[PDB]
Tab-separated table of C-alpha atoms in Angstrom:
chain	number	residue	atom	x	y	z
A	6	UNK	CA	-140.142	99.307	253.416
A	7	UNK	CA	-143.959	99.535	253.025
A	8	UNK	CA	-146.619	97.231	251.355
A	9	UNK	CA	-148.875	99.881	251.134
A	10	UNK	CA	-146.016	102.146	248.991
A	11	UNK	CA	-145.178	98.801	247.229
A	12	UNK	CA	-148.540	98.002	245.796
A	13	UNK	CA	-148.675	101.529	244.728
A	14	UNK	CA	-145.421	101.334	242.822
A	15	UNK	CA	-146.430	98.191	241.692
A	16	UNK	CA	-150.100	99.041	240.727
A	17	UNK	CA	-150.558	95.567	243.028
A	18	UNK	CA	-153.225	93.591	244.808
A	19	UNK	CA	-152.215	91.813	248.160
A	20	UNK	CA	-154.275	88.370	248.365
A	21	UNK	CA	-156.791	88.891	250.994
A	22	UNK	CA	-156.586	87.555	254.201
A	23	UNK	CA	-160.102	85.674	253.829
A	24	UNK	CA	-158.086	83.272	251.342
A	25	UNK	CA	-155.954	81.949	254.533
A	26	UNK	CA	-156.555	79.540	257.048
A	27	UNK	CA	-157.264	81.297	260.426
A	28	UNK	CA	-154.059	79.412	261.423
A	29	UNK	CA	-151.748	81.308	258.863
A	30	UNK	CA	-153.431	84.424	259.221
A	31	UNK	CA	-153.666	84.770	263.378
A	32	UNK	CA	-151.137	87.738	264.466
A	33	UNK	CA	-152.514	88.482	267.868
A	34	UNK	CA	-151.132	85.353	269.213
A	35	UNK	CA	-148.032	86.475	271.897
A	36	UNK	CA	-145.252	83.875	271.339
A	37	UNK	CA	-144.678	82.666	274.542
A	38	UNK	CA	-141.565	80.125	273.896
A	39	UNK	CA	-138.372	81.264	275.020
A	40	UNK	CA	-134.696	80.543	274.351
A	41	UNK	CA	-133.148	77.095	276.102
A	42	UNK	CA	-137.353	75.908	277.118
A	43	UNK	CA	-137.364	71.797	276.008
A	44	UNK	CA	-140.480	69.974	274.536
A	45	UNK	CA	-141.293	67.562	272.402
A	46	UNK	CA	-141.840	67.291	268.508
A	47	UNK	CA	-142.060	65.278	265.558
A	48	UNK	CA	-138.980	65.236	263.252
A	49	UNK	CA	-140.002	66.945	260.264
A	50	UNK	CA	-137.612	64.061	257.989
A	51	UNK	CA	-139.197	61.457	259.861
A	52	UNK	CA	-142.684	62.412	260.594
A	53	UNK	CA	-143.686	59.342	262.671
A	54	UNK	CA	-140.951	60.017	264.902
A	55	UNK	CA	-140.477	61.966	268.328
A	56	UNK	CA	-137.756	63.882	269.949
A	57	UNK	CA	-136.575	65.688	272.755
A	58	UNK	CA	-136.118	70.131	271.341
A	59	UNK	CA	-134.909	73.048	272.554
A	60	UNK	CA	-135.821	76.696	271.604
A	61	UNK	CA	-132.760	77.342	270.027
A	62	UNK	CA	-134.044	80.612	268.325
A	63	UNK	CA	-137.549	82.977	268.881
A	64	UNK	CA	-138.398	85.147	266.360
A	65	UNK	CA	-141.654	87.276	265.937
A	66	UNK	CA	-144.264	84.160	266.118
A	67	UNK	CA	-142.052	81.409	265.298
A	68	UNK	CA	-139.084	79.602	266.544
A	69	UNK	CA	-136.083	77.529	266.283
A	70	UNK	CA	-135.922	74.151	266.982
A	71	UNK	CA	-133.029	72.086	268.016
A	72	UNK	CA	-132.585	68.146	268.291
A	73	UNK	CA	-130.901	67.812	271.506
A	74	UNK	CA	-127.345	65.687	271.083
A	75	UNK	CA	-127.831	66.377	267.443
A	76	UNK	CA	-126.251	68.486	265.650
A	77	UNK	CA	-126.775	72.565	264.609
A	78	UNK	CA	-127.385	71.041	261.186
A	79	UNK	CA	-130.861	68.773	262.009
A	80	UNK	CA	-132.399	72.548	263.277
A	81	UNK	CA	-135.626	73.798	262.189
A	82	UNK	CA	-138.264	76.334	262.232
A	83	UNK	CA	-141.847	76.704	262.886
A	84	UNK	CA	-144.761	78.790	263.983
A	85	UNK	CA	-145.739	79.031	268.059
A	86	UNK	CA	-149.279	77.764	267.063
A	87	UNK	CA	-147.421	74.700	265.022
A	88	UNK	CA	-149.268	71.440	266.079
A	89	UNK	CA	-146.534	69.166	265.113
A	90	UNK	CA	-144.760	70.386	268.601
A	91	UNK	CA	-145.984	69.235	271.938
A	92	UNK	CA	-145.938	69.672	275.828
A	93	UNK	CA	-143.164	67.246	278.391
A	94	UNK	CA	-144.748	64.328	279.088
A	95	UNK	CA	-147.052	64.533	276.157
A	96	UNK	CA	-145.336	61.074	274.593
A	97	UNK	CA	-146.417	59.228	278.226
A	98	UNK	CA	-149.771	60.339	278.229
A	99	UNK	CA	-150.757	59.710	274.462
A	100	UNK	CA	-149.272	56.391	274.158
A	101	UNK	CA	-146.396	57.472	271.557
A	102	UNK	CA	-142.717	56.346	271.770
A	103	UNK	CA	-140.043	59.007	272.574
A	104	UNK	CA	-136.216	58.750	270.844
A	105	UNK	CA	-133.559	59.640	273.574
A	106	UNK	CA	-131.019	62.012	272.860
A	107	UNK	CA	-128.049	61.025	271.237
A	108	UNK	CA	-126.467	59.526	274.182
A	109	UNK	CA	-129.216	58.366	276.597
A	110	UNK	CA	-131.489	55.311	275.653
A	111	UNK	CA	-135.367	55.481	275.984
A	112	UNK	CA	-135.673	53.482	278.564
A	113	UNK	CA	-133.603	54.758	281.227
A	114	UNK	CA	-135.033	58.303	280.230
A	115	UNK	CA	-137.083	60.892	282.504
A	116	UNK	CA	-137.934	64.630	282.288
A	117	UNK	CA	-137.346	65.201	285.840
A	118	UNK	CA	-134.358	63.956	285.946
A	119	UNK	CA	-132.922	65.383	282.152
A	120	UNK	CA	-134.096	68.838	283.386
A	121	UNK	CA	-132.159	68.612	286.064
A	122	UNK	CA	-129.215	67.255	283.972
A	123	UNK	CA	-129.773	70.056	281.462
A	124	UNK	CA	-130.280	72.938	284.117
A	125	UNK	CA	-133.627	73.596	281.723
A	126	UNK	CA	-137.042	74.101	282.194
A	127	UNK	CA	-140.084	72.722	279.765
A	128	UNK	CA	-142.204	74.759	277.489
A	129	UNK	CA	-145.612	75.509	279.488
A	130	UNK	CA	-148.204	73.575	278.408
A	131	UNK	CA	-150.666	76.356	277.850
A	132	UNK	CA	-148.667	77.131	274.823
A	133	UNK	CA	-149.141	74.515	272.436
A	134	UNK	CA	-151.862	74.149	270.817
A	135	UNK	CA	-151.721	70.472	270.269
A	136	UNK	CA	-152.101	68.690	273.826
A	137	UNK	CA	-154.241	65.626	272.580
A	138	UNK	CA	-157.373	66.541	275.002
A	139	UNK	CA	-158.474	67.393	271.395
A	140	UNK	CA	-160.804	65.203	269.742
A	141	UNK	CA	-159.471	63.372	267.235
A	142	UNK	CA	-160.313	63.418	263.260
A	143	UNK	CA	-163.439	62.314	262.695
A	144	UNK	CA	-163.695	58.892	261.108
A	145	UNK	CA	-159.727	57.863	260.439
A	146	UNK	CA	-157.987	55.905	263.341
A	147	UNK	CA	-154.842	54.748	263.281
A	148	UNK	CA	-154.466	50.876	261.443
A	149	UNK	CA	-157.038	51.855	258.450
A	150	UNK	CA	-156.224	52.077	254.710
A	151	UNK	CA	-156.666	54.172	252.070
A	152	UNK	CA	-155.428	55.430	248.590
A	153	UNK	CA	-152.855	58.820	248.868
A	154	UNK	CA	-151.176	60.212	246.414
A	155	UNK	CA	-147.238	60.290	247.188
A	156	UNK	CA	-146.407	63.707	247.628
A	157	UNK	CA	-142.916	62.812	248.483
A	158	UNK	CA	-142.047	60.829	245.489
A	159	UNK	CA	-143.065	60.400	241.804
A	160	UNK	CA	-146.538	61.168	243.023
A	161	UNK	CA	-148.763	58.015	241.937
A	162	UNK	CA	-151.342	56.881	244.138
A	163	UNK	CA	-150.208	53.991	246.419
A	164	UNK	CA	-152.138	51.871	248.943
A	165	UNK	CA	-151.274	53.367	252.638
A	166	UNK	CA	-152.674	53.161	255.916
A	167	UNK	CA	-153.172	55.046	258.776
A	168	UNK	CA	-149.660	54.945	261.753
A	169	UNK	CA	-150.716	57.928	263.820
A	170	UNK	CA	-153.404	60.272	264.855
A	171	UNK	CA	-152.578	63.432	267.049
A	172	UNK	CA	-155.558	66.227	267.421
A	173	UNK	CA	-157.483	66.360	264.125
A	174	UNK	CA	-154.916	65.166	261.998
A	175	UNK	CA	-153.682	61.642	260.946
A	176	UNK	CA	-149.927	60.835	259.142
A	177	UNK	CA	-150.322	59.143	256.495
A	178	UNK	CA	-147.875	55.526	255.690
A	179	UNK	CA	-147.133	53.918	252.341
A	180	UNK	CA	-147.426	50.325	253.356
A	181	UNK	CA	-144.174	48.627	253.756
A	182	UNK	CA	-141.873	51.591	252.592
A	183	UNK	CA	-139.939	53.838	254.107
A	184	UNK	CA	-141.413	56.468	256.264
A	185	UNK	CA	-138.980	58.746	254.489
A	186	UNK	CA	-142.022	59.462	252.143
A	187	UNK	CA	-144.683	59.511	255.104
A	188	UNK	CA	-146.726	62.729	256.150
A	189	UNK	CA	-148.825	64.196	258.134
A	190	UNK	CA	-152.625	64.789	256.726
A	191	UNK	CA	-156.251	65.809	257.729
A	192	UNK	CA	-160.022	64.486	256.515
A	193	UNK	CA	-160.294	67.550	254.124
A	194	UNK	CA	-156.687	66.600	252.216
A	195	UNK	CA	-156.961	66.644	248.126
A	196	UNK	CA	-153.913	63.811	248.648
A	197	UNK	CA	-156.191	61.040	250.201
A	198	UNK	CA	-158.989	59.030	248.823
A	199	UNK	CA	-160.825	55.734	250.222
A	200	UNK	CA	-160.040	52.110	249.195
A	201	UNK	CA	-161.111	51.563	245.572
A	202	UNK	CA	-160.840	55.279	244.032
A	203	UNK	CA	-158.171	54.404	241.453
A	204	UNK	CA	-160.084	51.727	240.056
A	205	UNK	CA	-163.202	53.603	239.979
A	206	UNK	CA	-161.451	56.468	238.593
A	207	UNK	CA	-159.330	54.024	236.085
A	208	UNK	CA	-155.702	54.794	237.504
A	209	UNK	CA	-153.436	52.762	238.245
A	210	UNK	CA	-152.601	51.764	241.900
A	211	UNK	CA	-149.409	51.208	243.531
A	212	UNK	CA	-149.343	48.083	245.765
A	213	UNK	CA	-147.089	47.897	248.982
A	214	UNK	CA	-143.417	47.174	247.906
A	215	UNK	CA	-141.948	43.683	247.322
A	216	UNK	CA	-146.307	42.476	247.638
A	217	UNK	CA	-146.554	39.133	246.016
A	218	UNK	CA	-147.111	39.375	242.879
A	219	UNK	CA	-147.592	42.840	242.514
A	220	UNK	CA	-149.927	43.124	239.285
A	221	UNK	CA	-153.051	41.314	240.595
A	222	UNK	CA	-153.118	43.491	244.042
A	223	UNK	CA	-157.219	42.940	245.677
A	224	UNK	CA	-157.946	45.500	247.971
A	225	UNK	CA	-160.442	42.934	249.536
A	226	UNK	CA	-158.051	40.250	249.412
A	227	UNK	CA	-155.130	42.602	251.399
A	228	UNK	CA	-157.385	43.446	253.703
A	229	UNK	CA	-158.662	40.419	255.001
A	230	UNK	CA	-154.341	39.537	255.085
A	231	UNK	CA	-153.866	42.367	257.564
A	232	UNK	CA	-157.638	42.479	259.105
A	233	UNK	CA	-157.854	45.749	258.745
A	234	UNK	CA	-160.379	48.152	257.982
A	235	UNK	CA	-160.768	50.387	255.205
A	236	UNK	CA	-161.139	54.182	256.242
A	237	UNK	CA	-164.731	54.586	255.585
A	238	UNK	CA	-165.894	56.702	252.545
A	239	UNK	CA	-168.062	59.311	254.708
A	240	UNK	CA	-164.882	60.530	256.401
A	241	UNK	CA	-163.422	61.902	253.560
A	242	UNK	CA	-164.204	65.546	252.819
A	243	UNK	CA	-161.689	67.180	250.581
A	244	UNK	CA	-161.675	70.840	250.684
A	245	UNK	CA	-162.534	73.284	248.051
A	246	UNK	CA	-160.141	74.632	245.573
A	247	UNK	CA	-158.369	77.578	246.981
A	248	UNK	CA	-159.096	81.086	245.530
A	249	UNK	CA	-155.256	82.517	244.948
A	250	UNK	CA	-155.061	84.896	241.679
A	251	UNK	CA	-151.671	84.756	240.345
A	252	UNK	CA	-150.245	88.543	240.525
A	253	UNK	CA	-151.826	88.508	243.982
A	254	UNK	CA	-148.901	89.379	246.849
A	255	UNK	CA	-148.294	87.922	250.236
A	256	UNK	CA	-145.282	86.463	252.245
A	257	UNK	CA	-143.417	83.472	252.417
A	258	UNK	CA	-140.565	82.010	254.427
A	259	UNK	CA	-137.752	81.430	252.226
A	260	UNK	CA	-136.896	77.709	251.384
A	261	UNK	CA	-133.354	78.076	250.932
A	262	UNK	CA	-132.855	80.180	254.559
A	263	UNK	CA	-135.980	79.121	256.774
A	264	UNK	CA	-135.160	81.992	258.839
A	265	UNK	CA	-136.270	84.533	256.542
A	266	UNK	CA	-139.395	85.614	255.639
A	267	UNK	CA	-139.788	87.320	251.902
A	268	UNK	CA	-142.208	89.494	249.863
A	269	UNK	CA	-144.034	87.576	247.271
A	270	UNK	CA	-146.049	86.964	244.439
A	271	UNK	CA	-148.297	84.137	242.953
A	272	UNK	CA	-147.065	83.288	240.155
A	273	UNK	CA	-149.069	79.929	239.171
A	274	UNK	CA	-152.037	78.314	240.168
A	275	UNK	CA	-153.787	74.584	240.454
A	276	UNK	CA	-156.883	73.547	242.161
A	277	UNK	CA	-155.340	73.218	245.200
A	278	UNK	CA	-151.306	75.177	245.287
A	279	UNK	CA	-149.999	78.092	244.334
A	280	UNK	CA	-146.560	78.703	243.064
A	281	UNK	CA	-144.823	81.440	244.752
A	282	UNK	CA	-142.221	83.806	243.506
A	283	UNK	CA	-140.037	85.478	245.126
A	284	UNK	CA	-140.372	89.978	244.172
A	285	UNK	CA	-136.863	90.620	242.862
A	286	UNK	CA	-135.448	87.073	242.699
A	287	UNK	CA	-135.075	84.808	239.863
A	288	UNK	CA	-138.176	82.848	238.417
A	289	UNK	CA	-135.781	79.490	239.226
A	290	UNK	CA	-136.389	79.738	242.920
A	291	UNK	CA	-140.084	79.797	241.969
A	292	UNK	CA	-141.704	76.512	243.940
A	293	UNK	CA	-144.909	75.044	244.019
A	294	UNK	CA	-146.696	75.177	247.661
A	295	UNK	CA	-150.176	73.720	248.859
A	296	UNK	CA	-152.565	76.631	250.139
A	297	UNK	CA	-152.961	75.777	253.667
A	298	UNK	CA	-149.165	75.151	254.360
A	299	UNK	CA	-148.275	77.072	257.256
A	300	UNK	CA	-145.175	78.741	255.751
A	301	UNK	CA	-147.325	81.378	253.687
A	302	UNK	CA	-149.115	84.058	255.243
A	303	UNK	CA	-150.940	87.766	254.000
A	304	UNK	CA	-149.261	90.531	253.859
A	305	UNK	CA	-149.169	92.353	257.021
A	306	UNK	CA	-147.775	89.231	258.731
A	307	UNK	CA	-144.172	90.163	259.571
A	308	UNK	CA	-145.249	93.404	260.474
A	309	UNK	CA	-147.920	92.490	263.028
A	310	UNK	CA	-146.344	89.385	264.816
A	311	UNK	CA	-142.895	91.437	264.970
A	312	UNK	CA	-140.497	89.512	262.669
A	313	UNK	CA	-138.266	90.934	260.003
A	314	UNK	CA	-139.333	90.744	255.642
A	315	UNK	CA	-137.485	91.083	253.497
A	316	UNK	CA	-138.354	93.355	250.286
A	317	UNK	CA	-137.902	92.688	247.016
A	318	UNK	CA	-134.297	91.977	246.149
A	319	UNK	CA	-133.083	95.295	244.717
């Protein structure tokens, strides 16, 4: 199968390359992880967490990942240059708390000694490209508040605060709630604004849960409560609205099977997502996907970093 034969056939446009972040559209990057090599990395269903992997899986320029002690089900991939993975010992260095593997106890835990346990060897640090020597997000520091929008449920805006801060990026809490509905954010995120847009803006605002009281929530008051600061307004600098066409083409890792990669299509667009369709599929696995998440890449992808696509369902 060809992209250049397809667009032909098609009488299509792929979405240019300039539209990506560097990040999604590097291919010259060797993947350098290998099969059974341990590290650690946040769980993607509980963001604020850490955990002991394993490359369970390397394909093209992405990989795998497998909760040690857990089981095959809790697996999950991403991309070599994914910054939500890091380097052994990285939890002891940068102050963040590790969860042992389901039968150990972080406390009487050790890479030395789990390595040797495990007959393993760590991921190289010169691999990852989130080691925390990088300077940290300008401006946000774990403790402030702000407004975000919750992406992970009915999407109002709720007042949140600041839990973690690795490299240039920051997770994002909804104060006293689960952190089922936590994630992980930068300076330039659409999601995020500083204490006081909603009123400004005339929206309503979303206190933390079970606050006394709820309808008479004061920013000013809560944060003299908690003594904490307010991220300040200068930090925030959302990005510009992406430039996606819909009918443009690119690829996308399949939700349902996060080990394939398919030919797609744009099929909507908002300021700041795109909805994605999959070429040949129905319209009802059509999803809606912000532009800098690192599951989407330009065509030419696959091809260049050495992992399969799948064409158009025919």
């Amino acid at each position: 199968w060809s992209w250049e034969s397809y667009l032909e056939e098609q009488k299509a446009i792929t979405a240019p390359v300039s539209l990506f972040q560097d990040s999604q559209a590097v291919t010259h990057n060797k993947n350098g992880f290998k099969l059974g090599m341990k590290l650690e990395g946040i769980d993607p269903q509980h963001p604020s967490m850490y955990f002991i992997l394993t490359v369970a899986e390397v394909c093209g320029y992405r990989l795998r990942l497998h909760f040690d002690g857990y089981s095959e089900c809790h697996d999950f991939w991403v991309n070599a240059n994914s910054p939500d993975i890091h380097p052994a010992g990285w939890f002891e260095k940068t102050g963040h708390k590790l969860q042992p593997p389901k039968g150990y106890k972080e406390e009487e835990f050790s890479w030395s000694q789990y390595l040797r346990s495990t007959r393993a060897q760590a991921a190289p640090k010169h691999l990852f490209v989130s080691q925390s020597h990088s300077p940290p997000p300008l401006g946000f520091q774990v403790g402030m508040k702000l407004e975000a929008v919750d992406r992970m449920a009915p999407s109002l805006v709720c007042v949140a605060s600041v839990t973690d801060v690795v490299d240039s990026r920051f997770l994002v809490h909804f104060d006293n709630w689960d952190d089922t509905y936590d994630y992980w954010c930068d300076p330039s995120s659409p999601y995020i604004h500083p204490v006081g847009w909603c009123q400004k803006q005339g929206k309503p605002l979303t206190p933390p849960q079970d606050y006394p009281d709820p309808d008479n929530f004061c920013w000013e008051k809560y944060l003299e409560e908690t003594g904490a600061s307010a991220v300040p307004t200068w930090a925030f600098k959302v990005r510009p609205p992406h430039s996606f066409l819909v009918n443009m083409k690119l690829e996308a890792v399949d939700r349902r099977n996060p080990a394939l990669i398919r030919v797609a299509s744009v099929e909507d667009v908002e300021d700041h997502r795109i909805k994605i369709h999959f070429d040949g599929w129905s319209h009802g696995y059509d999803f809606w996907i912000d532009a800098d998440h690192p599951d989407i890449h330009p065509a030419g992808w696959c091809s260049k970093t050495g992992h399969p696509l799948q064409p158009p369902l025919g």
